[PDB]
Amino acid sequence: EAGEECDCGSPGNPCCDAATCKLRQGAQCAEGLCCDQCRFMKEGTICRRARGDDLDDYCNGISAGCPRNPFHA
């Protein structure tokens, strides 16, 4: 758990995939950025670049990517 509810929320692990960005759900900016068709908000949602001990961000123009504005402090 980083920002939002979702264990599979990882930048590249579209809030679940257990194989490859292709979750029948739709990790569109879940606990962590998504990479599957899932889709993405566009407004400061959750670009969470990482978790571990830190690393985060908000969703903007995040078609499975991440904006260029400062979010994680």
From Swiss-Prot:
Disulfide bond annotation, renumbered to this chain: 6-15, 8-16, 21-35, 29-59, 34-38, 47-66
Placement of sequence motif Cell attachment site: 51-53
Stretches assigned to the Disintegrin domain: 1-73
Function, as annotated: Inhibits GPIIb/GPIIIa (ITGA2B/ITGB3) binding to immobilized fibrinogen with an IC(50) of 2.2 nM and ADP-induced platelet aggregation with an IC(50) of 131 nM, respectively. Inhibits angiogenesis. By binding to vitronectin receptor (alpha-V/beta-3 (ITGAV/ITGB3)), also induces apoptosis of endothelial cells by blocking their attachment to extracellular matrix proteins.
Official protein name in the record: Disintegrin salmosin-1
Shown part of the complete sequence: 245 to 317 of 317
